Amino acid sequence: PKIKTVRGAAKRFKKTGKGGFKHKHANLRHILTKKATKRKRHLRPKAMVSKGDLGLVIACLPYA
Template sequence: MPKMKSNRAAAKRFKRTANGGFKSGNSFTSHRFHGKTKKQRRQLRGLSMMDKTNVKRYKKLLPFK
């Protein structure tokens, strides 16, 4: 039986939390900030939690994390 492997693309983008959820970086943060409000820019900082509906899918992609 072949080895189980983590999906490398997902491993670089998502981190598992202690409670079993996932956190990831926000989209829309690479350029063109002049078109965004200060509130939008502030809220795009840091990481955001993955929606619960996607957690099952990401657990399959990252079995060891």
């Protein structure tokens, strides 16, 4: 049978051109009045998944 996609990882990651995955940063959902604006400003943009944890992502997203 077909492999089933981990639907949480499909809602959390998007594949880029060269096969990497973009993701949203954490820590930007609440508790935001004590955080510096510099920190948040460096947390709004999407980041790439690191080389170490990219294998578990590919295992969870076999269908890209």
